[PDB]
Design a protein around this ligand. Sequence first.
Ligand SMILES: Nc1ncnc2c1ncn2[C@@H]1O[C@H](COP(=O)(O)OP(=O)(O)NP(=O)(O)O)[C@@H](O)[C@H]1O
Ligand SMILES: [Mg+2]
Lengths: 370, 193
Amino acid sequence: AALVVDNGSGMCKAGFAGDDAPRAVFPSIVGRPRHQGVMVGMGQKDSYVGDEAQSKRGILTLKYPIEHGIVTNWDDMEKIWHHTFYNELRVAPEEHPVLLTEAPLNPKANREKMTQIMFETFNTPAMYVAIQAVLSLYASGRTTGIVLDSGDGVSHTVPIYEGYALPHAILRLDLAGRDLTDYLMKILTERGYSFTTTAEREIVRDIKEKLCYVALDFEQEMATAASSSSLEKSYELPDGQVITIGNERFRCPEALFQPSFLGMEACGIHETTYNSIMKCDVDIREDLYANTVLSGGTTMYPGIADRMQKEITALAKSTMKIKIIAPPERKYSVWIGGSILASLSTFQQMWISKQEYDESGPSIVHRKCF
Amino acid sequence: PTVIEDALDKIKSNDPDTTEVNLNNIENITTQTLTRFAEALKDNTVVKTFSLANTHADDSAAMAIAEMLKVNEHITNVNVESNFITGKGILAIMRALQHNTVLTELRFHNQRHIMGSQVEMEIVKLLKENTTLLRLGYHFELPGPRMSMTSILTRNMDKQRQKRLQEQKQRSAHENLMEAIRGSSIKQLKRVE
Ligand SMILES: Nc1ncnc2c1ncn2[C@@H]1O[C@H](COP(=O)(O)OP(=O)(O)NP(=O)(O)O)[C@@H](O)[C@H]1O
Ligand SMILES: [Mg+2]
């Protein structure tokens, strides 16, 4: 009867183990009165949480407890977790063990505090902590490989070997989906229509998710774009006006492979992946190449895996096979991997029990987990 | 959605059946009224939660609350969110908590303006000497103060883990697990939307 909770930097997916999908998915967000003192539509509340926060945003300032996959506000994190258990999931944390997720290179302090909150505040029988990337690998039915997890805030390359991520070869790239909505915002604004209001930035993100794609050959798709209109598409904004973009469709996610488009001196995701592989043991590289799993919403662009295969095939040795796995359910692959794991009977021996914590304190999480 | 006059009257009356004092989203905006709420609660012992969220409260109110938190020894939770308090009022409160054993939760979110780097590192400095506070409702902009703080609150709660500990008192597994994770797939899961 285990619970699984994937805390995203901007979206929280929580449900029961062994389920196909999470029963609860709401915005990891805590909103409070905008300002100008007592300009209230709320009666007797100091804040809203979850869905109620996304609505009522008119006079709310919306703040995320998780930034770049790391908890930066533990009070609003405990709020989101209470809201999860009691309001959205409708369960007693005392009668279920909880599997929680963390980001790569999470600090140890936040891991301890995560565990301490689970055992003290919510008084859970047992609990566990797993890396999101690793749970995506498990969800792809794999135990070894390399995962490119690009979500809302940050992008991580995580080599994994037989169930353990490799911290020395993890690579971090500070470029994710929100940087791509911003980029698209700028290229669309510049040429005609001003996207300032955040309510309209949600329209820009919807354009991104509905019309953008990744070109296999960028400079060819630019030349196609300039020679013909074969790549044009139109979009219907709420006021009935329509806009036609063609060349922005693949220029927006091109930033993933050429961060310089965003004035970034970093290297794209293809180099970041390959470079991570080169920091791994020379024995396992061949199984990393053949098992490069994609996860995260920002990896949903069409043609992303095709260009991964191409660019990495250009970097690697002519000998190796490069297979890029792009599951379905990539937006929920982290949760589903957690549901599998928590369901496995072989995993029940691995939980952390509340007695163990009462004896050793939250520090016990560094061993018995990683 | 609460009357100020009669409720206040219950505070200074120390009504047995007033464990909550909720002034959230009230237009009174009287600094004096809130400051006498502080004096009212100063000798009170039933109240365990005094909240005033989004009342346009200023620094003086934060001062009254600050000195008072040493007198009152029964309020476990204080809330001053969404108000207009500066590093002065907040740092005053923190200096009060320098020696205050009862208070366990304090929240000041969505304030008028940022506190400031030096104000935040000051907060962490003062609260380094506190052991009873378990939850602090604030988002540090600087990573240093933030990690220091989470460490503090972790050890304060640990003290609960330890005291409770003595009170109440007196690999092949991983490898087979992996073998099991490879043999799994989504077809084993309960289909649901
Ligand atoms: N079809 C799509 N094409 C492109 N981007 C998409 C698509 N669907 C979702 N996204 C983006 O993917 C991101 C959501 O990633 P998500 O899986 O929620 O990560 P997260 O857990 O919320 N944040 P993090 O903890 O940093 O991984 C957002 O930036 C979305 O705009
Ligand atoms: Mg993620």
